[PDB]
DNA sequence: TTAATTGCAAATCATTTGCAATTGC
DNA sequence: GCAATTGCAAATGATTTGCAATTAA
């Protein structure tokens, strides 16, 4: 009953409300990259005594505590995921909701070279691929 | 006529006074202005231009792939004339200024990752964030 | 000639905020 | 007890849209 993310709060000394418990639960069990509205929908599908604004506040708090990473894929709304322990980029299926995580060391290395050739130290990056399923 | 204006005449689009100016601006820019910034540039060359016209015009231009749009991480759409050759962006985190690069090796590798997963690449987005040495 | 565009304001959209009430530790 | 948190509801800030008058073509 004490979920992955719920524990992270306890260790950081954050007060654990009913609402924060279920948001933590929902986000703990989520495999994909939901937006704030999607979190609301799953949060209430577990307990209705939760307001739209506290999803927003909680999602923000979690982000501030490095419990969540935020992505602005372009589609207007902010989407969230539990902060991974290893870096990855994103492959968005333009034909469904499938989001595919991937790594490419060759790319990461090429990114570093480009910064260096340009007299920059690379301090971060955003990579997103957009795909359709192959048609031979 | 500007390059952009040439494109509207050829596309069949009505050229208005305001469109003539908004198109003059974005043909001349070599940076990545936001809508307010494009409005001020336009309001200057001819003050008889609404903000909504700017918003409408920039929407139109993008849909006609006359312009390209970007969200460089400042919660605000930025725009440029569609370049001849595709390029990605490196952003100076100290000044928010922007450098444009290309890299066939990355483009080739991107396609290969997509294929590796049962996909064909149809668009991508690559930004680099850096501090100057 | 006549349908597209403009200017204005009000309306969306996602997100935040003031405040009175509510609740965990 | 009390300080922290919640829930409306009513501000946002950026972008759009409805309508009447205007204008390119
Ligand atoms: Mn990467
Ligand atoms: Mn991910
Ligand atoms: Mn590229
Ligand atoms: Mn550019």
Query: How do B119-132 and B88-92 pair as beta strands?
Result: parallel
**B127 annotated binding-site participant:** no
CA distances from A52 to A5, A60, B79 (A): 20, 13, 33
**CB B11, CB B64: distance < 8 Å:** yes
Separation between Cα atoms, residue B23 and residue A84, nearest integer Å: 44
**CB B26, CB B80: distance < 8 Å:** yes
Among A72, A74, A92, A70, CA closest to A83: A70
Interface residues of chain A, partner chain B, Cβ below 8 Å: 72, 74, 91, 93-94, 100, 102, 104, 106-107, 110-111, 114-115, 118-135
Q: Residue B71 sits in which domain range?
A: 1-83
Q: In chain B, what are the helix, strand and coil shares in percent, each to the nearest 5? A: 45, 25, 30
B41-B43-B45 Cα angle (round to 5): 70
C-alpha Rg value of chain B to the nearest Å: 17
* B37 and B49 housed in the same domain: yes
* A71 and A5 housed in the same domain: yes
Among B112, B105, B76, CA closest to B88: B105
B113 to A104: CB separation less than 8 angstroms, yes or no: yes
Chain C bases near protein CB atoms (7 A cut-off):
4-10, 13-18, 23-25
* B78 and B120 housed in the same domain: no
* A79 and A121 housed in the same domain: no
**CB B93, CB B131: distance < 8 Å:** yes
State both tokens at B99: 């450098």
Alpha carbon B109 to its chain centroid, in Å, reads 25
Q: What is the resolution of this structure in A?
A: 2.6
* B3 and B46 housed in the same domain: yes
Q: Which residues contact A89 (CB under 8 A, 6 or more apart)?
A: A101, A102, A103, A104, A107, A127, A128, A129
Name the region of A76 (left: φ>0; alpha: ψ -120 to 50; beta: rest). left
B133 to A124: CB separation less than 8 angstroms, yes or no: no
Separation between Cα atoms, residue B62 and residue B50, nearest integer Å: 19
Number of domains in chain B: 2
* A99 and A70 housed in the same domain: no
* A6 and A67 housed in the same domain: yes
**B5 annotated binding-site participant:** no
Task: Tell me the CA–centroid distance for residue B53 and ligand 2, in Å.
Answer: 38
Ligand nearest to the Cα of B88, by number = 3
* B74 and B89 housed in the same domain: no
Question: Is strand C within 7 Å of residue B21 (CB)?
Answer: no
**CB B118, CB A133: distance < 8 Å:** yes
Separation between Cα atoms, residue B106 and residue B89, nearest integer Å: 13
* B9 and B22 housed in the same domain: yes
Find the CATH number of the domain harbouring B103. Answer: 3.30.1490.190
Alpha carbon B6 to its chain centroid, in Å, reads 17
How crowded is residue B133: how many other Cβ atoms within 10 Å of its Cβ? 9
The owner of tokens 């952003």 is B91
Separation between Cα atoms, residue B93 and residue A102, nearest integer Å: 26
Collapsing DSSP to helix, strand or coil, A125 comes out as strand
DSSP E strand stretches across B30-133:
67-70, 78-81, 88-92, 98-101, 119-132
Find the CATH number of the domain harbouring A73. Answer: 1.10.10.10
The owner of tokens 């499938």 is A98
């Amino acid at each position: 009953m004490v979920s992955r993310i719920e524990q992270r709060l306890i260790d950081k000394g954050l007060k654990v409300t009913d609402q924060r418990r279920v948001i933590a639960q929902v986000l703990s069990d989520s495999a994909d990259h939901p937006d704030v509205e999607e979190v609301y929908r799953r949060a209430t599908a577990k307990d209705p005594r939760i307001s739209i604004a506290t999803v927003y506040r909680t999602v923000r708090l979690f982000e501030e505590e490095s419990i969540l990473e935020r992505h602005d894929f372009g589609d207007g709304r902010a989407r969230y995921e539990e902060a991974p322990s290893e870096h990855h980029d994103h492959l968005i299926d333009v034909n469904s909701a499938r989001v595919i995580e991937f790594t490419s060391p060759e790319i990461e290395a090429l990114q570093r070279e480009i910064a260096r050739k340009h007299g920059f130290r690379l301090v971060g990056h955003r990579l997103e691929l957009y795909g359709v399923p192959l048609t031979s």
